[PDB]
Amino acid sequence: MDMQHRIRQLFQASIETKQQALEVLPPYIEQASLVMVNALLNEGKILSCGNGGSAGDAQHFSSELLNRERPSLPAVALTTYNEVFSKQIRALGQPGDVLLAISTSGNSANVIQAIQAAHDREMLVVALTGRDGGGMASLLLPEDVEIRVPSKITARIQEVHLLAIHCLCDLIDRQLFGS
Amino acid sequence: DMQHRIRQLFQASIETKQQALEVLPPYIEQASLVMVNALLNEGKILSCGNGGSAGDAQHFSSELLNRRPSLPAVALTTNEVFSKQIRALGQPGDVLLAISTSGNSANVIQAIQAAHDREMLVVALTGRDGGGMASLLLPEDVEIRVPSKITARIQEVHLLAIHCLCDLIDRQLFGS
Amino acid sequence: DMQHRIRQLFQASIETKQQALEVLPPYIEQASLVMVNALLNEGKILSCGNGGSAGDAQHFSSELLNRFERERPSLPAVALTYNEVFSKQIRALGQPGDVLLAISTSGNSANVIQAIQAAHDREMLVVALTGRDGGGMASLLLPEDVEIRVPSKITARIQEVHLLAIHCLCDLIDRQLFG
Amino acid sequence: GHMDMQHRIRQLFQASIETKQQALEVLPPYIEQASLVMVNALLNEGKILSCGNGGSAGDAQHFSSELLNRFERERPSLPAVALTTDSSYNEVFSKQIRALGQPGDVLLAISTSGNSANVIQAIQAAHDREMLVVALTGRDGGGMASLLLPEDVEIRVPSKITARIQEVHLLAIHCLCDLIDRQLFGS
Numbered sequence: 001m002d003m004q005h006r007i008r009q010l011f012q013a014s015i016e017t018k019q020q021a022l023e024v025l026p027p028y029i030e031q032a033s034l035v036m037v038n039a040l041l042n043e044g045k046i047l048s049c050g051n052g053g054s055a056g057d058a059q060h061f062s063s064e065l066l067n068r069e070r071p072s073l074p075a076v077a078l079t080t081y082n083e084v085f086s087k088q089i090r091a092l093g094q095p096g097d098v099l100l101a102i103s104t105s106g107n108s109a110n111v112i113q114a115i116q117a118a119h120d121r122e123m124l125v126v127a128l129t130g131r132d133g134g135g136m137a138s139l140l141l142p143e144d145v146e147i148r149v150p151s152k153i154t155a156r157i158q159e160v161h162l163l164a165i166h167c168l169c170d171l172i173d174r175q176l177f178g179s
Numbered sequence: 180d181m182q183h184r185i186r187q188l189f190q191a192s193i194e195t196k197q198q199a200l201e202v203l204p205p206y207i208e209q210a211s212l213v214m215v216n217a218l219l220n221e222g223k224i225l226s227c228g229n230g231g232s233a234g235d236a237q238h239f240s241s242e243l244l245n246r247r248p249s250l251p252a253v254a255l256t257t258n259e260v261f262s263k264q265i266r267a268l269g270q271p272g273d274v275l276l277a278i279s280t281s282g283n284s285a286n287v288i289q290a291i292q293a294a295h296d297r298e299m300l301v302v303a304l305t306g307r308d309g310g311g312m313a314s315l316l317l318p319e320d321v322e323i324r325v326p327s328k329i330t331a332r333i334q335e336v337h338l339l340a341i342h343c344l345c346d347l348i349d350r351q352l353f354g355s
Numbered sequence: 356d357m358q359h360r361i362r363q364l365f366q367a368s369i370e371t372k373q374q375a376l377e378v379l380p381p382y383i384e385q386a387s388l389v390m391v392n393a394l395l396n397e398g399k400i401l402s403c404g405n406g407g408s409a410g411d412a413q414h415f416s417s418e419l420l421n422r423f424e425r426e427r428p429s430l431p432a433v434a435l436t437y438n439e440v441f442s443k444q445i446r447a448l449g450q451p452g453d454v455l456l457a458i459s460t461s462g463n464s465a466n467v468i469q470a471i472q473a474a475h476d477r478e479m480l481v482v483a484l485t486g487r488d489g490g491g492m493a494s495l496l497l498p499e500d501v502e503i504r505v506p507s508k509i510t511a512r513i514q515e516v517h518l519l520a521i522h523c524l525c526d527l528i529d530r531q532l533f534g
Numbered sequence: 535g536h537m538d539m540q541h542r543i544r545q546l547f548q549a550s551i552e553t554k555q556q557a558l559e560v561l562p563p564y565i566e567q568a569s570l571v572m573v574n575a576l577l578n579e580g581k582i583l584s585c586g587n588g589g590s591a592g593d594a595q596h597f598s599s600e601l602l603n604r605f606e607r608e609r610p611s612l613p614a615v616a617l618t619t620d621s622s623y624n625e626v627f628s629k630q631i632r633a634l635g636q637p638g639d640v641l642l643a644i645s646t647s648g649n650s651a652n653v654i655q656a657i658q659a660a661h662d663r664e665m666l667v668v669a670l671t672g673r674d675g676g677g678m679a680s681l682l683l684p685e686d687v688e689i690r691v692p693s694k695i696t697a698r699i700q701e702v703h704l705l706a707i708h709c710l711c712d713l714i715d716r717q718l719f720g721s
């Protein structure tokens with residue numbers, strides 16, 4: 001009785017959070033995918049990163065796109081001391097590339113450091129966040145895009161992030177190659 | 180591009196979770212009792228999956244292991260890649276959490292067989308028609324099949340389903 | 356002169372190995388019997404390392420378990436992959452009589468030290484691959500544990516002798532179990 | 535201790551020692567040459583990509599992680615990155631090389647036999663991006679060696695024994711890093 005209730009409860013919270021997100025996120029998902037499509041078109045790449053339950057999201061986004069029957073898109077997750085991402089971005093990133101930075105709270109020291117490295121290399125940033133945006137939100141420059149899930153709950157934020165990413169991939173293919 | 184297309188993807192996501200809500204909860208409940216059972220009997224949970232399911236396997240385990248008290252859940256961390264590790268680490272009673280969008284991942288199929296040889300129970304997160312994984316399941320195993328043929332929809336529901344399992348285990352062992 | 360330096364590095368590598376040859380073989384033999392005894396008693400080997408010692412740990416377990424380069428039976432050797440990430444996996448997976456292969460070049464890795472503690476707590480024996488003079492962790496070992504301490508302070512030379520030592524461990528395990 | 539095991543341990547030590555002594559007599563010119571191509575690439579604002587299969591993968595990641603992260607040693611970070619795997623699958627390296635590689639960059643490619651299809655394909659991808667290749671190999675060099683253009687460098691360990699090739703590879707990698715640091719940051 002309680003367990004079936006709790007399940008229904010979590011399902012409905014997940015669904016309600018997505019309906020809220022539906023009202024506020026589409027313009028930001030559109031701008032991000034556009035920023036990404038323009039970078040690819042100019043022979044740039046996308047580097048993605050995230051901490052913990054966001055790390056899978058960075059690699060899900062990238063593998064989808066890199067490993068393909070549309071053309072392989074140059075999208076690489078960084079993987080494998082808050083400098084782990086930042087150093088790879090300095091090694092790999094060139095002007096006009098795009099950083100996808102994923103953090104449910106926006107407080108990841110190493111994603112914050114990632115965003116500085118991306119700015120130093122003249123890259124645009126697509127930031128996937130939740131809650132109040134955290135420290136990352138405040139570090140975004142005017143040309144950067146923020147996709148902020150309207151929720152405080154870590155697990156609902158993650159659920160909308162997966163969806164957001166699936167939206168970005170889909171809009172990237174439609175814009176580049178066509179429906 | 181199209182906001183209209185974004186709303187459309189969001190609406191499709193919502194609709195599948197609604198379809199999933201009408202069919203999955205009793206299985207989600209079963210799996211969780213199976214997992215709480217094994218953990219109370221001093222056992223453990225191993226998880227696995229390929230493609231867009233590997234992260235889910237890790238996300239489940241490292242919630243429970245790393246953090247509440249830590250719970251013995253380990254993700255198999257790389258067609259006998261998983262099967263070999265189950266043989267080595269599995270003990271009678273343990274649970275395998277196996278995740279696949281198609282039900283056709285050859286190494287998770289061999290993961291399921293290895294778990295059976297260990298006298299382990301299997302919880303299978305699947306979609307579509309359940310593939311070769313469904314046909315391997317024994318009566319005491321639990322399928323959680325997403326009523327969708329679309330990979331991206333199954334993945335979205337699989338993450339919700341994994342969040343539920345975690346929640347129900349903590350609910351039963353610790354309470355709320 | 357770059358030639359002078361290469362031939363100096365090769366000689367330092369050869370010379371460390373020669374001095375390793377004078378202290379190590381008893382401890383390699385003892386380490387391997389411990390591992391063989393555990394496996395014959397239906398046990399398993401868990402292995403762990405940090406930094407450059409981390410390939411070593413994976414290489415050890417990958418070798419025996421997957422058998423990608425030689426055709427003999429698979430052995431339950433498993434590499435482990437926040438000072439508690441190793442501790443917590445050992446606690447979750449280790450059963451009494453199991454063996455931990457613990458690798459580091461300094462002997463000071465916080466997690467590997469805590470891996471040792473988690474191994475003893477689970478009534479496991481430890482084979483410890485170290486260099487320098489073992490320092491800590493090498494002071495945590497109990498009478499039935501085994502240390503293989505490279506007679507060197509140079510990280511690179513220690514890595515080199517570790518790889519050889521692991522190759523000796525795997526080889527004698529097979530030699531004792533399959534002749 | 536018991537004789538056989540003591541015999542086996544000491545015979546392996548001796549074979550490792552003897553393989554290194556043989557390697558010493560033929561590898562230095564190619565090791566120097568390799569480190570020169572790497573240094574020249576970095577001086578021209580290049581980067582190094584590394585890859586390897588099975589037991590070589592560790593070497594690949596060891597090389598680039600030391601150079602880039604600088605845990606073990608406090609000197610400047612160098613743009614050296616290991617190519618990942620983790621979820622046909624023979625294109626995992628080449629797909630990344632085509633995304634990340636630039637004209638002038640260097641691929642350090644590691645294989646003991648030289649026949650792994652994904653490293654063979656990595657070499658092609660590097661060539662298509664106008665990158666130079668440093669190939670750590672053994673035995674006869676395999677298919678990999680057959681693909682090397684004249685600006686490339688091969689470091690072929692003079693052994694047919696996997697374990698022996700792996701040990702010399704680790705040494706080669708330690709020399710390359712030493713030589714890169716010497717040339718850039720002082721002997």
Ligand SMILES: [Cl-]
Pocket residue numbers: 328329330331
């Ligand atoms: Cl589909």
